[PDB]
Amino acid sequence: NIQNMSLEDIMGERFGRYSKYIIQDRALPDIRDGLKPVQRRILYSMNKDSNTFDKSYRKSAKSVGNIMGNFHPHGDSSIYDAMVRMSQNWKNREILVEMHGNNGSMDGDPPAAMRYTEARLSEIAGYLLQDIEKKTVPFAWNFDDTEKEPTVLPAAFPNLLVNGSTGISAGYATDIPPHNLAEVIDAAVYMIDHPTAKIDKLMEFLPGPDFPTGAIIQGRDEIKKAYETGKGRVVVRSKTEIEKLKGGKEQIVITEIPYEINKANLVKKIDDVRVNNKVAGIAEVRDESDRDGLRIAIELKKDANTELVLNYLFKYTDLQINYNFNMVAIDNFTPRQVGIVPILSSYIAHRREVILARSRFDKEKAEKRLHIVEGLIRVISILDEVIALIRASENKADAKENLKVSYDFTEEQAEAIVTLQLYRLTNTDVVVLQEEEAELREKIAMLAAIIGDERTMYNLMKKELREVKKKFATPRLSSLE
Amino acid sequence: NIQNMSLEDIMGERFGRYSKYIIQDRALPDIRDGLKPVQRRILYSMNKDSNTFDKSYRKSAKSVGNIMGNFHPHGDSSIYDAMVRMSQNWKNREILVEMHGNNGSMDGDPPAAMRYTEARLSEIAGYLLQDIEKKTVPFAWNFDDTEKEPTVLPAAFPNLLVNGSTGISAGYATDIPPHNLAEVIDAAVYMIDHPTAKIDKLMEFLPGPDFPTGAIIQGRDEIKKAYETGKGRVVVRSKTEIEKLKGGKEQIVITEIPYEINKANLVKKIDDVRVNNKVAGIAEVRDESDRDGLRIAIELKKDANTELVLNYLFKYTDLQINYNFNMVAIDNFTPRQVGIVPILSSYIAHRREVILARSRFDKEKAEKRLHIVEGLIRVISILDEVIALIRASENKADAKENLKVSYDFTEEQAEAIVTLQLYRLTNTDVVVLQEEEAELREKIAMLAAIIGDERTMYNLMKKELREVKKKFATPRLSSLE
Amino acid sequence: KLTPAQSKNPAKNELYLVEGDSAGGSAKQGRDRKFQAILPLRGKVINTAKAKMADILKNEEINTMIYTIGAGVDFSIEANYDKIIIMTDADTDGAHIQTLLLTFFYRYMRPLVEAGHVYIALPPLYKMSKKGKKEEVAYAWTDGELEELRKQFGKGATLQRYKGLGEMNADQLWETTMNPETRTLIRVTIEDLARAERRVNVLMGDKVEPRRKWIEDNVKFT
Amino acid sequence: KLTPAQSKNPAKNELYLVEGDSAGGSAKQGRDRKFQAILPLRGKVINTAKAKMADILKNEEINTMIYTIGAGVDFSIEANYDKIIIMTDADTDGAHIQTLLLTFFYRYMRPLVEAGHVYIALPPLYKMSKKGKKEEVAYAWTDGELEELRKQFGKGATLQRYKGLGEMNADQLWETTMNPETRTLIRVTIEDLARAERRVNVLMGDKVEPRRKWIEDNVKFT
DNA sequence: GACTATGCACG
DNA sequence: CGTGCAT
DNA sequence: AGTCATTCATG
DNA sequence: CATGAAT
Ligand SMILES: C[C@H]1COc2c(N3CCN(C)CC3)c(F)cc3c(=O)c(C(=O)O)cn1c23
Ligand SMILES: C[C@H]1COc2c(N3CCN(C)CC3)c(F)cc3c(=O)c(C(=O)O)cn1c23
Ligand SMILES: [Mg+2]
């Protein structure tokens, strides 16, 4: 009833367990599908539950309870908040959950509890899940040992670069900014053709990030550094206009702010600058944003120090901030700090394995059906005898054995024959069958081609990647200066 | 864009809607299965989800999310708290949900959140649900109009009297105390034989309530009044012992307290009596209850005023309280105040309808199978011709028509024949079939008997009621004085 | 705590009393902030027919209403909005909340109602839709309107039954129930007074035996 | 807030530090109140290697520990329990919490550990059962013990993997981890001091670059 | 249903 | 000063 | 994952 | 002064 351990051992073994789990299984994104385990489980669960984009929204609580009871052994709050986040166009460049109800805002208000909202997967999220039922991807057991779960998703576009990630564990942290789907795709495609793609040319397709919040991004040199090493500081500057004000008054207008900042608070601080008179061009500050548009009006008074005062805010408020790239992902089960090349290459390598496995699956399915169809073709020629032999047997198993021994059918063939229902006899057309046969034999050859020909395989990757480009492409929001 | 209503109309129509719903669909128990809508939905849902007693406990959150998304359009807290309550042996005489985790206690501590606990239906709860899949009971649509829900459960024992209910709506409230399963059953059985059972004889089987908390109950006269009208005050007195204390000291021990009171608080008040010295026999007060037993020790000092002091507590603390019967249930969609007779009679009348419907269902199923089996028997005699005719047809539908027209089989018969698989031909035994035939024809006669013979029907009710008695009976806990 | 309108104008300023901290959020998000204020009520409102005066004024919801509006409760009158609009779920509990607020306004702010300053908002009960980027949606408030919509959207089109305000986004809340041009409000009037006072007291009052009778007489639980 | 033992006895009095208000409830319910006290910690405990002194003493969990125990933090020593037992989930986060508490005890209450007064409790990781009124159950703590149980219960018997303390009732908590006769505890000792101090500082400390290296060197994420 | 404190990295 | 999965 | 107020009937 | 489905 008593053991002894040193504090030295307890700490090491405990901390080791916590750190490892935090790193792999909690805080950090897989480099391939760009997902943290919670997110992946949310997607995988909602999809298994046929809670997709083309069907009715479902009561958030049901989805969460389901994720929690089958896949994710942590609190409902964690799951739900993670869910809400995946539904926020200001946080993700491409939203992966669509939600109905109050789900927060830029002014940082509290999202409504799961007992109010309703959710479903978005359309593009279905793409991360594409082919998941063709054994394309490694499965593991859940905690119950009652069901299997994916360790990574098929990921039909490159979610890591697109939605980005952040990002705090033990020992490492991660900050990755969102990027433009179309652009990322274009780079990946280039790298497929030219594997040794140097960073410089890549930048030509993929230049700087693309924040959902738009704004202006300065630091090409810094961006190159981040894409090269993994780390960089870039400057993010909210987007401004000028308005002329009846009466010799000038107005400062802001219509995009930096990624990840609380608009309500930004406004308050801009106002605080005025109250304390930390600058002179101060007048009134007003937030006039409504459904369908962001508008921040800082109108000054007489001495329109406009360029002077504007410049002050960029310094002292968050109207201008910096963003740091710290690109850390999980590669081969362990944290790596990565620039664009490794991220792109591993994503490609992943689609390779996926496309190969998909094909291997589809091939097998086809040869199995072929094998059966060849059997049916033969059966027809001796139908009367085969029916007789079956009537003469003693049970299912005995009939099967007789077909095998007597007519040399295989087990899989006998089983298929013996289970035909009677009405099937209504059609004894060798021709219809042969047509199916030829179709199968062609599916098989084409699959065999994709499998044993790195080139055709890679061509398929490209075709698919471009199809996703056309369907989901959207214009840039961030500008680069 | 504008309507006008008087405040007079708005109030009437609004309040009317709220009251009606509160009365029927929230606060008050159906007189038949003794359940409030939330409870019924909890049971119905957990059962549909195969979350029964003989399988593994499930994560409470999943069950709740499921109840909420399919059946119950209210908050998770409401559902979960109602669930927790159904799992508390001190509140229900027969628990209907079994839970794993902290689910409260008599000292009134907060149950653990749904994200910790695990649940399943208890065994006896499966009995409320018995036969629910044989169309024995009225179904309605859920709010989605996506699924159907029971308006009442089959209720194979009389849950209303057994677990009781409370009980607050608009206009009415309900308080019904728990009763001893065995006893209630015994009364119901008597009333089945002697429908005009007067209350006096009924009391002979069912005398006073049986609280899970045990204790002592005084007021036979009052109990009669409650069972007669619906209303009564009964006295409930905690159960006491005396201990002799080395040193000329006497100890007061309590080992059962009244229904529905907070033991931790009872203790505190008993202590408060001592501090303020509202009585002299005061000494020390100690709660020494552990897992597996309730023990409250009030040990006095020298002047052992024992019977004097004990008597004081019965007055001034809750060691003794009164309980009031206000038996209100929903009968024919509307609130009625009811004594034992109406409750028992309506429960019987309900089992009647259930047993009739069950039988009507089982009969139909049987005649359908018989009809098919008769068909198969014929088929065998002309098998060769029938097979030929099928091979000669053009498709499923054409073969069916030919069997009908040519051999006068019915549609249901043709459909069954035509869908037989080939291996079935492996057995052409008229005898095996005829045996099934005879068995069916006997099920049918017996059902026809139950249906058209009030007496045999009522005999079945009794047999079933007694089987439930044997399986779930437990001894009384409350005593009557 | 209250979410103000940007400008002060007793002439065209709207005070929304919303059932739920959560719907209050949505209302804040989807709304013209130039002149509509939002005041969420957390759970059931005190019954001011059945309480003492002490309890009432010590109640957070009542006091914030009183302060935001101005007048008092004697009341005085115009301060401070030209519309007090009660916005709740179209469900039983929402109905209950309208009862509770109207009782309050009736009993203390009575002139507000008489000058037709109190409204009730009509959230749509139904949404019609027919996948993805090209999904179309319409809204209906009644038995009949729904009938209209289903024939227009014909088959394939699926129907949603709104179980509450929480289920709808902010732009939607604007489009259907907040935007003066498109919204439909009910305006509460009192026709008589004594009739009103009797009703309010029988329903909302302390005694009960009469409420019970009112219910037995008038509620037809069939 | 703390749930005391009925009697004061520095000699055989147990202080359970439990992870969760909720498990704390269960522990209160299932336990010998004659001499075991319960003190739940709400969420993650402050890291006392990485903080200032101000933050630490202003922390609710730390202060209540200090007060309930007595000594102080200089510490003095015997007041006030003869066992401080850390009881958490056998999962990663529980492991994290043991790290955090041991760092505290190590840094401020150091003599407590040296005199062998600090324990860690071992909740069972597995429950075995084979329906209804006649359901039988056994508990196992390890790879091997489970192997033992499955052969005994043979087939039909199903296994539960405890994902936390919340999943077990009060009598169970007593039977498996609280009842001195049947419970199994780990007793924390320190062998050396300098070795300990280094480790505690690299893991729990402010700097990081060294923690990272420790992790790259020692954590085998295969 | 809002609020309330912590770990973890980092700038 | 605050990020987001965890307690 | 506590705490915080209110409806409704009633004794 | 609470009880228990609702907000
Ligand atoms: C772990 C529980 C208990 O304590 C919590 C908080 N406390 C801070 C530290 N305590 C000493 C006082 C209370 C808190 F502020 C937030 C949460 C919280 O957000 C939460 C949730 O599931 O996400 C769950 N809990 C929280
Ligand atoms: C409706 C929301 C908001 O408010 C709530 C409370 N208040 C906050 C301040 N209010 C002005 C009145 C009291 C409260 F004390 C309890 C609950 C609560 O238990 C709860 C639940 O789901 O069951 C939900 N809510 C509660
Ligand atoms: Mg509602």
Ligand SMILES: [Mg+2]
């Ligand atoms: Mg845990």
